[PDB]
Amino acid sequence: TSRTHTSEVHGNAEVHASFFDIGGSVSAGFSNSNSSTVAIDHSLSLAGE
Amino acid sequence: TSRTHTSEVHGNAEVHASFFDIGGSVSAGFSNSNSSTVAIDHSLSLAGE
């Protein structure tokens, strides 16, 4: 089994360019995650000599 | 065999600075994924000492 925890910072930057319109943009953000993997495995090995 | 639950929490933020039509959007997020992953392996080895 595996349980995780993530952090993140986000950003964006885009300005406008038209015949009349100008602009600008900034941002933020914090993202996380909680992944719960439950892995069930089986194996076989048949060796000879 | 593996069946994975990946829960997510998240926070989001955007803005668009302009003259008078300035737009902003802070936000968040919540998500899960029910990912059932199987994997079938067949292998070999030929060792000689």
Author numbering:
A (entry chain B), B (entry chain C): 295 to 343
What does the original paper state about this entry?
The available space on the heptameric PA channel for EF binding can only accommodate up to three EF molecules due to steric hindrance. Indeed, 2D classification of cryo-EM images of PA channel bound with EF showed that the EF binding varies in different classes, suggesting that the space is not fully occupied. Therefore, we used a symmetry expansion method in Relion for 3D classification and were able to resolve the asymmetrically attached EF. Unlike LF, all the domains of EF are well resolved in our channel complex structures. Upon PA binding, these disordered residues of EF (residues 20–30) refold into an α-helix (EFN α1) and bind within the α-clamp site. β1 (Leu33 to Lys35) of EFN forms parallel β-sheet with β13 (Leu203 to Pro205) of PAN. LF α1 is angled downward towards the pore in the α-clamp site, while the amino-terminal end of EF α1 is elevated ~2.9 Å as measured using the carbonyl groups on LF Glu34 and EF Glu24. This elevation in EF α1 appears to be caused by a change in the orientation of PAN Phe464. The phenyl ring in PAN Phe464 is positioned outwards toward the bound EF α1. This change in the orientation of Phe464 appears to restrict EF α1 in its elevated conformation in the α-clamp site. While in the PA7-bound EF structures, the HD domain contributes to a new conformation by bridging the PABD and ACD.
